[PDB]
Structure 1
Amino acid sequence: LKSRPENLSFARCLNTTEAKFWQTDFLKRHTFKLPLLITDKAVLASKGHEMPPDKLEKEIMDPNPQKSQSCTLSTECDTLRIDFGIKVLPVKESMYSCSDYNYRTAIYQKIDEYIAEDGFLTLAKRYVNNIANARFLWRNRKGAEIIETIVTIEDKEYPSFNSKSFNLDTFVEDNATINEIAQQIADTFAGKREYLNIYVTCFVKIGCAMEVYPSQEMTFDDDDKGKKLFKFEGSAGMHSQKINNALRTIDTWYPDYTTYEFPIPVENYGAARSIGIPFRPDTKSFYKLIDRMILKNEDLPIEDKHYVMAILIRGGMFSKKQE
């Protein structure tokens, strides 16, 4: 093994589907639900942007028509309900394309070493922690009275959570339901199982006629000008990759971690848009780390193995420029 394969690629081992939005009442949340539609809106603002003084002297007092969309609850429902699901696939049976066979054998050997060493328990525990504390609500988490989350596997309905008590900076390892679910997730990841299906339903209490924040569509120059919200089967919803970004916010092993002291989403270069600082520029980058794991066959600390396996769960285009 002298270099990376020219067509190395990976799939994703955590398939997340689109979420759907429903509204109901907290005292009857197990009995009925109602659809939540997206409404159009048009506003008349003022020219409040920063302008050069010459234009500012001539159009400071001009109106400005704008278009937008908004999604709000009704006057008789105060609880927002979010339903989605996750499919878990084995890590070893997810390598999509690779040219060299020896590289595939080496990758399989290293994955087997990590399975025999750790057993995929830490990453599974962190993923179910990110599920538990309801990080996927994003802007809907602020100003909520009661947030509850339940997880259903096949027909076994686990007892409800309380994501308000879970801190967003530390990961617990002693919750009974969290460890029980993480056991199945780790078994599926290692290869003892072949597939896992998990369904998540979340109830958020915010008050009557409040505002919800679904995902916003991305528009280019040719498209119409204005804010567009994401519609899923008529009702509002969230993107799959928006939810997946919240689940994989488990990276606490980057350099200069003690200075900042918060997890970041697992990226290739460790970039975090929340604070706008790269965290794995050269030395702890995934490209440099996996070049020492395979080509040099040099053993790494367990933190680097954790980060590498977390990246390989996500997958991507790890190709080479035709050496």
Structure 2
Amino acid sequence: TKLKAPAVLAYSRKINPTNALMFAVNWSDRDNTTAVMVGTKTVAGTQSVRGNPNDADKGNIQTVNFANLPHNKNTLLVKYNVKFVGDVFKAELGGGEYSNTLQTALENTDFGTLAYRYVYNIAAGRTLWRNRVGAESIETVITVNDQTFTFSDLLVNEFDEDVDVAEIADMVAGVLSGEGFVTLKVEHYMLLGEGSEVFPSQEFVENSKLSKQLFDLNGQAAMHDQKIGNAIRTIDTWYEDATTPIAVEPYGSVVRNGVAYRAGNKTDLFTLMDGAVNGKSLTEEDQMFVTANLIRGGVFGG
């Protein structure tokens, strides 16, 4: 007993998405993909900072980025490849006095549901935060091992039953429970309207710097890989007072709301893995949450 957790214990990320490159298409002209360019407009304004009152007279020529659709294409296309990898129970930096006990404590994990919610967050449009808002038509095409799947009307908040997501979830759960990998090429086509302004992900700017950096690969608007990884693991409906699916965190913590849902109420990942290697009976939902964290990965040492 009293199997104390290793200080070096970490797990690798098992859902690896690429950067979500963003293109402009039409709804019936889906093959002509023109890359959405981040424009950048200059704004003239004096600097106002707390530490330098002497520098407020002149300076701060700032040039803020923006990204709209072109005025001939009404559909935004978002392309990214989500790579699910198996052996989520292998610790990369941990070892096997604790990670092997985790293997033999989370073998009864229903990966079917875990994978369903992953592919449902892929398909329903959780990966399209501010640009699925106000779109009159949502479409998702998933290409997986030469199989094409079409999704039109999936409400993203609840994980309802559709056999299309389920079909992919099968091979995704077979990867995650076993050994190997699977790759889902996900292209989202959302009809926002003619010249509607799109929403790339944001680089962190300083309190000063410029107003807003949109995410650029080679000049073209895109969204962060870790931001999509936040979308995919947004499956946590099993904490106490669970209203909406949150991103599976080791503490159940969302930064933008200023509260942590699983911290400080004995449902955090660390107490559940210590309970697993000390062998108390877990329910299915918290064990699924622990396996979702191990799929997410991260260093758990102290």
SS in 2 for 1:246: helix
| Runs (5+) with no aligned partner, structure 2 | none
SS in 2 for 1:138: coil
Residue 233 of structure 2 corresponds to residue 285 of structure 1: no
Whose helix fraction is larger, Structure 1's or Structure 2's? 1
Aligned counterparts of 2:147 and 2:236: Cα–Cα separation in 1:
30
1:105 maps to: 100
Q: Which whole-Å CA distance do the structure 2 matches of 1:290 and 1:93 have between them?
A: 12
Q: Look up the match of 1:208.
A: 194
Kindly state the Cα deviation for residue 317 of structure 1 after the two structures are TM-superposed: 0.6
Match of 1:196 in 2: 182
Q: Any conservation in 2 of the 1:36–1:73 contact (CA below 8 Å)?
A: yes
C-alpha contact 2:89 2:103 (8 A) present in aligned 1: no
Cα distance in 1 for partners of 2:276, 2:125 equals 34
User: Residues of 2 paired with 1:268 and 1:93: CA distance?
Assistant: 15
**What corresponds to 2:18 in structure 1?**
17
Structure 2 partner of 1:43: 43
1:80 and 2:70 correspond: no
- Quote how far apart the aligned CAs of 1:157 are: 1.6
Cα pair distance change 1:110/1:161, threshold 3 Å: same
Give the structure-1-normalised TM-score: 0.83
Q: Which amino acid aligns with 2:230?
A: N
Tell me how far apart the structure 2 counterparts of residues 313 and 73 of structure 1 sit (CA, whole Å): 35
**Which residue of structure 1 aligns with residue 34 of structure 2?**
34
Aligned residues with identical type, % of pairs: 33
Matched, 1:231 2:213: no
Q: Which has the larger radius of gyration?
A: 1
In the alignment, the residues of structure 2 paired with residue 103 and residue 187 of structure 1 have an alpha-carbon distance, to the nearest angstrom, of: 24
Residue by residue, what CA displacement relative to the aligned partner does 1:204-234 show, whole Å, maximum 9, x if unpaired? 111112211111211347x944422211132
Q: 1:246 aligned to 2:231?
A: yes
2-structure distance, mates of 1:67, 1:229: 12
1:153 to 132, 144, 155: 144
> Is the 8 Å Cα contact of residues 67 and 227 (structure 1) preserved in structure 2?
no
Equivalents in 2 of 1:211, 1:226: separation in Å? 17
Looking at secondary structure, tell me which structure has more strand per residue: 2
1:112-170 residue CA offsets vs partner (Å, 9 max, x unmatched):
3x25xx3x111111111111211111110111111100100132222x111xx322321
* Counterpart check, 1:141 vs 2:132: yes
- Normalised to the residue count of structure 2, the TM-score between the two structures is 0.89
Structure 1 residues not aligned, in runs of 5+:
none
Give 1:276 deviation, angstroms.
2.7
